[PDB]
């Protein structure tokens, strides 16, 4: 035992470094080596209160603390805690400061006997926290209180009298914070902030109602530029933590707009423009503020975060202060991730704003515009691309005249994300000049960081262009092979060197998806071997890119790729079983893509995967139980394996028998695989607190029930898993699920509602009339949700009601109750979007009704006509999609009504207004009742339609032109990327037959159309 050797060196060494590090090692040894105990005890106490330098003082103290936890377990050294308490109230400030320090060290040991002393500590610290002599004493007291709070809560029932005491000490801890900042004590200002962060986690009885007021205080610190920056970062982090752990308290105070605008002002502060433009921390306040806005947008309603930011968009964007223009753009770009729906609806304001940024004189504003666009494209992919006509020339110019390496990167990075989602027929207009520019750039730039961005942009061209990329395919692969040499040799390659290789593998495989196997056949043998070389390499990033190549190959070659299973599945299983550890992000990414490749292979190599099912579910099941960041993906992949297995049993998507199975329509072998995954799915939603895992689970379950029917959730008349499912789903609707129980909501919470509503919409289509018994518990809640304060909640609910009605059809025994509710919405709701979704349900219910609805035709039609007339006024793509969906839904509803009871409807004014909104621009499913009505009206030789034949042909000209545009895309588009005009082949033929008769009649005006003349013959 060299324990005493350590303390003797700690006390008597000539070098303070020695005495210090001796005590550091003495602490470690106390546990292992602790008769003359009392000789060492007294020397330690003496040196603690007398050594000149606090650093050596603290050393002895910490040894004392571990020693004291040892003896209290033997219930020895009874004098320690009483002497320490005596010394804390001694008249010598230095004696008190050292006593409090030792007490904190004791509390840090977490010894159970300290629970016997809650009152002493509360009484003692209530004094010491106000010690006017020593700011260190007050800060140590604040720190000790965090441990005393935990102690009082370990008790089954928290003692009220204690918690009242603690709740009064909180205003004192704020006072210490003021002291530490006035005196410039940054070290203790941090320490106190940690005590405030720890209060967020406490029960409400201990804290009082102080949380909002703490946030209000942290904001006032954070916005004041006189304060040291490092102190302000502390303040912004504290608010950020409050949004995470205590958002309920923030909402009560409506502190969202305060938080947002506070962080918006902090983010408008001067920054290192030169470092911004070339560097490749988040300890400057302006940057921590953006992380605040980010968290705020993800936790609170867009009314709290986004509405303020967008209210301030006009003035900051035109300010003469470049950092304000830069700020509002970056603020938006961090907003889109948490509030993408809200952001998309502000595209009328935001897109012109990013266009303004691209035109700024100051490069820092230009880089903020670009980051904003990148962020827009990542989250709202297609929508941003539509504006390519203005973006592309502005972004290309920035590349040409770029003077800084980071501008070039983000210009290239924005071009990538645009091209990636630009529409097939639009990229063709541009394909040749961009390809020449992209390759011109790839030649010129030599830094791998830039070349990697150009390579991704070039691959994005392939993605958009699909077949249209074949002229460039060979030319491109020739150039790119230079980046994919010596794959196994990773030594001496920089992080970016691997990235330039990894991306080249990934985007060459995206070229194969674009130009399918026939044009890819030239390079399959070398590339597939290279990719397999990457899998065997030792860089997670490089193995990851190999898996990307495999997963894309699976798409291109299908079953032809089965011969490779034997070599690949072994490497995939190895990758997935890796340790994930701080956490190794490179491995996490590598595991995500390997799991994707596994799913893609099973779907592709249909029969051949069967021997791999048990192992793949075994490996994937394991990761669900034990993985850190792969549970959601791993579960999704288990369902992809089921999809592969069911597809191999020639169970066709959508062709299941409706209703509850008294037995099974899947062979016993496949049903075993379903049940295995179904139990794992149910277990990860029941009492699950991560709303990510619930959304993910509910989504997989909803898709798989839609594809393969109720067997996914129940078999052999045993509804045990179906009942558990509804309990959880209904729980989410009531707002009472584990993940909810930690009135405007966050888009994330909205999404949780929708996916639960979608569990019902999927079951109703799967059970039809057998659904009614399940639907009964949810029906009042969903109906209730139709009347919510939230327009978004109303819209989701009314839409789900409509889709439930469609699944139940004429076996709906609640049609009358549903119709009354949706008519109320159709009539009285103030949201056009809600009234539009209601119109769809109303027509469906009327179509399925077998009772008498003559009473409600006149009011419903008057409401419908009004919805049309306000949408006519509004006729900003966000409004245009709602306006256009209203046109389709309203016209669909009238049509369903005329087909149901043609004689209760006056066709004279109705048919004209209907024609006036055809052809549609969206929601072409509502063409189906309109087609059926045009078929009925002509066979009756109904005059109103027969005098209106010319517009009818013009409409079918467009209908048929779009169906052939769409058929072309189906063959040209990249493999794996609702545009249907006809909901069935039968209705298509019936429309065709009518087009012939129209030709027989009316002097053949149908054939006078190139488009229909082609279809008539």
């Amino acid at each position: 035992a060299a324990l005493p050797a350590l303390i003797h060196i700690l006390q008597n060494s000539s070098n303070d470094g020695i005495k210090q590090l001796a005590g550091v090692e003495a602490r470690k040894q106390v546990s292992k080596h602790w008769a003359t105990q009392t000789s060492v005890k007294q020397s330690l106490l003496n040196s603690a209160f007398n050594e000149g330098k606090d650093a050596v003082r603290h050393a002895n103290a910490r040894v004392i603390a571990s020693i004291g936890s040892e003896e209290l377990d033997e219930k020895k050294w009874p004098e320690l805690i009483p002497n320490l308490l005596q010394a804390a109230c001694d008249s010598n400030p230095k004696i008190r400061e050292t006593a409090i320090f030792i007490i904190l060290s004791l509390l840090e040991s977490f010894n159970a006997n300290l629970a016997l002393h809650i009152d002493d500590f509360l009484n003692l610290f209530a004094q010491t926290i106000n010690d006017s002599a020593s700011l260190e004493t007050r800060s140590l007291s604040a720190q000790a209180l965090s441990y005393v709070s935990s102690l009082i809560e370990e008790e089954g029932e928290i003692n009220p009298q204690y918690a009242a005491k603690f709740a009064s000490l909180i205003p004192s801890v704020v006072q210490v914070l003021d002291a530490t900042i006035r005196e410039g004590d940054t070290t203790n200002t941090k320490l106190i902030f940690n005590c405030l962060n720890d209060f967020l986690l406490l029960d409400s009885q201990l804290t009082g109602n102080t949380i909002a007021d703490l946030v209000k205080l942290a904001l006032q610190i954070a916005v004041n530029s006189d304060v040291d920056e490092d102190i302000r970062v502390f303040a912004v982090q504290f608010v950020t933590s409050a949004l995470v752990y205590r958002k309920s308290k923030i909402n009560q105070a409506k502190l969202g707009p305060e938080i947002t605008l506070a962080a918006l002002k902090v983010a408008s502060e001067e920054i290192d423009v030169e470092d911004e433009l070339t560097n490749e921390e988040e300890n400057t306040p302006a940057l921590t503020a953006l992380r605040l806005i980010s968290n705020a947008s993800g936790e609170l309603s867009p009314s709290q975060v986004g509405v303020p930011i967008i209210e301030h968009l006009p003035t900051m964007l035109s300010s003469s202060n470049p950092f304000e223009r830069r700020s509002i753009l970056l603020a938006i770009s961090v907003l889109v991730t948490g509030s993408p729906d809200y952001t998309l609806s502000q595209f009328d304001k935001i897109i012109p704003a990013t266009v303004t940024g691209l035109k700024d004189s100051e490069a820092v504003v230009q880089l903020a515009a670009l980051k904003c666009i990148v962020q827009l494209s990542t989250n709202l992919q297609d929508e941003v691309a539509r504006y390519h006509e203005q973006y592309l020339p502005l972004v290309i110019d920035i590349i040409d005249s770029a003077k800084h390496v980071v501008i070039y990167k983000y210009a290239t990075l924005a071009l990538d994300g645009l091209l990636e989602f630009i529409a097939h027929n639009d990229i063709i207009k541009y394909l040749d000049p961009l390809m020449n520019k992209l390759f011109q750039m790839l030649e010129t730039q030599q830094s791998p960081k830039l070349r990697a961005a150009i390579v991704s942009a070039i691959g994005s061209c392939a993605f958009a262009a699909g077949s249209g990329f074949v002229p460039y395919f060979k030319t491109s692969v020739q150039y790119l092979q230079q980046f994919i040499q010596n794959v196994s040799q990773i030594e001496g390659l920089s992080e970016d060197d691997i990235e330039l290789k990894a991306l080249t593998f990934e985007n060459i495989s995206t070229m194969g998806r674009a130009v399918k196997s026939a044009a890819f056949a030239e390079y399959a043998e070398p590339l597939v071997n290279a990719a397999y070389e990457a899998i065997k390499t030792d860089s997670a990033r490089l193995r990851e890119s190999g898996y990307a190549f495999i997963a894309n190959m699976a798409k291109v070659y299908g079953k032809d790729f089965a011969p490779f299973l034997q070599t690949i599945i072994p490497e995939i299983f190895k990758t997935l079983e890796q340790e994930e550890y701080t956490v190794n992000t490179g491995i996490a990414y590598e595991k995500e893509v390997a799991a994707a490749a596994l799913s893609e292979l099973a779907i592709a190599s249909k029969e051949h995967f069967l021997e791999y099912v048990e192992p793949s579910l075994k490996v994937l099941a394991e990761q669900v139980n034990e993985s850190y960041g792969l549970k959601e993906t791993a579960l999704h992949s288990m369902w992809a394996i089921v999809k592969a297995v069911l597809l191999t049993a020639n169970l066709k998507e959508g062709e299941y028998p409706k209703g509850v199975p008294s037995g099974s329509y899947v062979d016993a072998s496949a049903l075993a695989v379903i049940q295995t995954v179904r139990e794992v799915s149910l277990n990860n939603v029941i009492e699950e607190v991560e709303t990510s895992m619930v959304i993910s689970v509910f989504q997989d379950l909803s898709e798989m029930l839609r594809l393969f029917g109720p067997i996914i959730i129940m078999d052999n008349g045993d509804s045990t898993h179906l009942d558990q499912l509804c309990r959880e789903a209904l729980s989410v609707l009531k707002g009472e699920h584990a993940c909810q129980t930690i009135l405007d909501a966050s888009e994330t919470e909205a999404t949780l509602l929708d996916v639960a509503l979608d569990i019902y919409v999927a079951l109703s289509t799967n059970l039809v009339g057998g659904f009614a018994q399940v639907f009964t518990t949810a029906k009042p809640v969903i109906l209730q949700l139709c009347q919510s304060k939230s327009k978004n909640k109303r819209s989701f609910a009314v839409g789900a009601l409509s889709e439930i009605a469609l699944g139940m059809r004429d076996e709906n025994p609640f049609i009358q109750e549903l119709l009354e509710a949706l008519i109320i919405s159709l009539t009285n709701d103030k949201s056009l979007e809600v009234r539009c979704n209601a119109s769809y349900g109303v027509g469906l219910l009327i179509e399925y009704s077998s009772f008498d609805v003559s009473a409600i035709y006149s009011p419903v039609l008057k409401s419908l006509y009004e919805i049309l007339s306000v949408a006519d006024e509004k006729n900003d793509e966000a409004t245009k999609e709602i306006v256009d969906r209203t046109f389709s839904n309203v016209c669909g509803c009238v049509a369903r009504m005329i087909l149901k009871h043609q004689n209760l409807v006056p066709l004279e004014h109705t048919i004209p207004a209907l024609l006036s909104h055809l052809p549609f621009n969206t929601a072409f499913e509502e063409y189906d009742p309109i087609f059926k009505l045009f078929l009925k009206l002509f066979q009756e030789q109904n005059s109103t339609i027969i005098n209106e034949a010319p517009k009818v042909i013009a409409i079918f000209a467009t209908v048929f032109e779009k169906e052939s545009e769409r058929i072309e895309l189906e063959t040209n588009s990249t493999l794996g990327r609702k545009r249907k005009q006809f909901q069935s082949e039968e209705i298509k033929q019936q429309v065709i037959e009518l087009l012939k008769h129209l030709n027989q009649q009316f002097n053949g005006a149908v054939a006078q159309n190139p488009v229909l003349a082609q279809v008539i013959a």
Partner: peptide, 7 residues
Amino acid sequence: GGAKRHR
């Protein structure tokens, strides 16, 4: 997932 990348 309707995008080119798999991560």
